[PDB]
Design a protein around this ligand. Structure first.
Ligand code: HEM
Ligand code: HEM
Ligand SMILES: Cc1cc(N)nc(C[C@@H]2CNC[C@H]2NCCNCCc2cccc(F)c2)c1
Ligand SMILES: Cc1cc(N)nc(C[C@@H]2CNC[C@H]2NCCNCCc2cccc(F)c2)c1
Ligand SMILES: C[C@H](O)[C@H](O)[C@H]1CNc2nc(N)[nH]c(=O)c2N1
Ligand SMILES: C[C@H](O)[C@H](O)[C@H]1CNc2nc(N)[nH]c(=O)c2N1
Ligand SMILES: [Zn+2]
Lengths: 403, 405
């Protein structure tokens, strides 16, 4: 009835009973698995989601069934009945945000889930204020290189109006400029957003690592452009511990991974602007951002710099160059005293997390394809661990781009 | 718009719809509530007859004769045979077609570009364990072809009502012994502890090496299994050395040339071939990454990183990554030197991408298990990482089956 879950390195077996609390369907059916795909109210429905969540919260503070619990449930019924919606108390918001992260199946960093600074920005009435709030988040989370996990939560969605939105997918991204010759200068994943910025008045640069401005949108208004002060945006120059020529490549990356386009759902309420950040796992930069062929695509350049036989696949020049780039990322971050975790350290700590969650909740939703690192997969323990994937609430979700 | 899974490649930005999955008639382990895709392991006349009809229809379509009187006569022949015996039998060319189709249908195989080139050995006349041995030896000889490896399958008689199965007890035709030591550790391949112990229980005099080739335990219907040692001259092995690291040869590592799965059930039109060993050639990561570096296999990563003088005390030196790359390269280099067919994970995956286009055009999709198709080193460096895949069961199929003991 409940799925048997095996680790193939150790022979150990658990049963996932947590998955029974999923109320939201994923993409798979018995006929076909779609788990490798990247992408996919009325009163009584919102109310039942609100109840579930208030239940979750009072249980977390061990006050299940108490007066404060009963009274709070009534406040929610009263507010929904009269207004079609309700509001969270700060402490509930805090619990909700932590729980959304905990429940994130694609996140390998979840051992940190209980350590999250939550800035309540629900008294935000303008794109200008959104910016102040965004800048403080960056200041806090960066902390001179000693990164701290943080989320800032802007005003929820409301029936009769447009959303607060951050158009950018992260608070910090590098520009991608489409050239007339069809090639991209900069980061190719950011061509569209670079263009949008330009359309809304941004004076472009012409470098490979021009940090983008933020397009911020208050309800039903044109987005506004804000340039981040360079002082707030910590970058790390890339060098290699043994290869001197590496630094000459002029490669660099920003310190702060902060997602800014995902919706945060708590008890049926929706937070369309709720950016969050932690710290990088080196492979995100060393492997995906720098080596993906549809990103900076630096493999060949590096392999040529290493004088590798680039003529045949069997020389494993791709694999060899990839390792040095991952090493350069780690070394550079360690040298600049900026928090990073390598994919071995990270997956080992995720295994501990799976164990903690088994005892705590009877399971952990996890998306195997995203948990296993993009290089050296079977060299990490998560490769050998079976995983059950499902949707729990509170959750982060994708939402449509606002343009 | 289309009411079929949309499939995107994120490298190239291109889109397809899988319409083939509509043909699936066996449910996998996933529900809308939870995805179980990462789990390794998750007759009556009526059921048999419909399975048969569908296979026969598959066969006649593949020769472009759907609806023809030969098609409808063969259907008639099939039901009349089930009507009177409870089973039926495949024509020679129906077996050949079904064996290839089963390979083509296997979601976990990255080598499927090759699916149309399979030598199908018909061994449905086989009536003893001794004869299975002869057939298996002939299989190994033909498939090995002195290192110019050839895809092949040998098909032994089908499961019958109230008669024992033909079974090969070993999971592969060639595997190394794993000896459980006095100190609890394992000498040889830890994956093969059980089969080694079974071999010894059935009178095998064991060796004491890291790379001892196992004997076969072969079972004819309703008999105890008989033990057969493969003549060593038949078992091509490759000594492992590295192109520039001179000391690697001194580790004394080696692997067999021929990957030959022998414990899977080949199902075709409801008929069950309990003994149908099939063989191809290796993708290099199978040996160099999994068999050699898995913690629960040979586990040689630390040894090699020490030899390479790496800092094995800290994760962030990427010592595991560095050694793994060299062990893989050693595998490739050694097989190439020995003139034994092998394919690297870059070529293999590049060619599977091409197989995906072929199949899109031919069948409207291709069942694929992303976790198994993506190699265990350098995942996102290969194009399959960036390709969404739809996984589902088609028949003919290879299936896991329970161990005979
Ligand atoms: C503390 C350090 C953290 C590390 C090392 C980490 C690691 C990762 C990695 C490697 C991914 C996959 C990213 C990709 O391949 O694009 C990921 C995804 C994700 N993380 Fe974490 N994470 C951390 C903190 C956080 C925090 C603070 C939150 C929210 C409060 C969070 C929520 C998520 C979500 C929702 C995803 C999947 C959404 C997406 O990026 O598409 N993580 N994480
Ligand atoms: C021609 C060269 C071939 C290559 C390079 C190749 C490659 C692979 C690889 C890398 C795997 C995953 C194995 C693992 O991780 O343990 C696999 C699985 C599989 N292969 Fe192929 N293969 C080839 C030929 C064949 C042939 C001839 C057949 C059958 C006629 C076949 C049928 C299968 C099946 C059924 C599986 C899944 C069963 C399992 O779990 O091992 N392959 N193949
Ligand atoms: C908090 C935190 C820490 C960390 N290390 N890492 C993260 C997420 C990663 C980082 N860097 C990008 C984020 N992940 C974004 C994943 N993209 C979704 C796929 C997609 C969908 C639609 C369009 C498109 F182009 C792509 C968060
Ligand atoms: C024909 C061919 C060519 C090739 N390159 N490769 C192959 C399959 C590989 C080879 N070498 C092992 C096979 N595959 C092993 C299948 N194991 C998964 C299920 C299972 C079941 C029981 C125990 C266990 F640990 C795991 C076949
Ligand atoms: C198509 C496939 O699902 C896609 O490439 C996924 C695979 N696993 C991933 N895993 C992580 N962490 N990040 C990713 O972007 C992806 N991409
Ligand atoms: C848990 C996970 O499914 C398991 O370790 C799988 C992952 N992918 C694999 N892929 C291949 N090709 N071979 C394997 O043995 C595995 N093991
Ligand atoms: Zn699934």
């Amino acid at each position: 009835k409940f799925p048997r879950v095996k680790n193939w390195e150790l022979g150990s077996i658990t049963y996932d009973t947590l998955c029974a609390q999923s109320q939201q369907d994923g993409p798979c059916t018995p006929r076909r698995c779609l788990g490798s795909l990247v992408l996919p109210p009325p009163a009584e429905q919102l109310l039942s989601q609100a109840r579930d969540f208030i239940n979750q919260y009072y249980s977390s503070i061990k006050r299940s069934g108490s007066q404060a619990h009963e009274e709070r449930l009534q406040e929610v019924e009263a507010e929904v009945a009269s207004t079609g919606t309700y509001h969270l108390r700060e402490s509930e918001l805090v619990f909700g945000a932590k729980q959304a992260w905990r429940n994130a199946p694609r996140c390998v960093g979840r051992i940190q889930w209980g350590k999250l600074q939550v800035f309540d920005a629900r008294d935000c009435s303008s794109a200008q204020e959104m910016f102040t709030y965004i800048c403080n988040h960056i200041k806090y989370a960066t902390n001179r290189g000693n990164l701290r996990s943080a989320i800032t939560v802007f005003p929820q969605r409301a029936p009769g109006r447009g959303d607060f939105r951050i158009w950018n997918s992260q608070l910090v991204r590098y520009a991608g400029y489409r050239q007339q010759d069809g090639s991209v200068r900069g980061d190719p994943a950011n061509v569209e957003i670079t263009e949008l910025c330009i359309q809304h008045g941004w004076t472009p640069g012409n470098g490979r690592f021009d940090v983008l401005p933020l397009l911020l949108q208050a309800p039903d208004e044109a987005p506004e452009l804000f340039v981040l002060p360079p002082e707030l945006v910590l970058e790390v120059p890339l060098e290699h511990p043994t290869l001197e020529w590496f630094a000459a490549l002029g490669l660099r990356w920003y310190a702060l991974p902060a997602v800014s386009n995902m919706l945060l759902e708590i008890g049926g309420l929706e937070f369309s602007a709720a950016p969050f950040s932690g710290w990088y796992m080196s492979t995100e930069i060393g492997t995906r951002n720098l080596c993906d062929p549809h990103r900076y695509n630096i493999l060949e350049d590096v392999a040529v710099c290493m004088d590798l036989d680039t003529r045949t696949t069997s020389s494993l020049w791709k694999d060899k160059a990839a390792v040095e780039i991952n090493l350069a990322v780690l070394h550079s971050f360690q040298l600049a005293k900026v928090t990073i975790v390598d994919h071995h350290a990270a997956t080992v700590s995720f295994m501990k997390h799976l164990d903690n969650e088994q005892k705590a909740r009877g399971g952990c939703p996890a998306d195997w394809a995203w948990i296993v690192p993009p290089i050296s997969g079977s060299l990490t323990p998560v490769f050998h661990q079976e995983m059950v994937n499902y949707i729990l609430s509170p959750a982060f979700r994708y939402q449509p781009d606002p343009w």
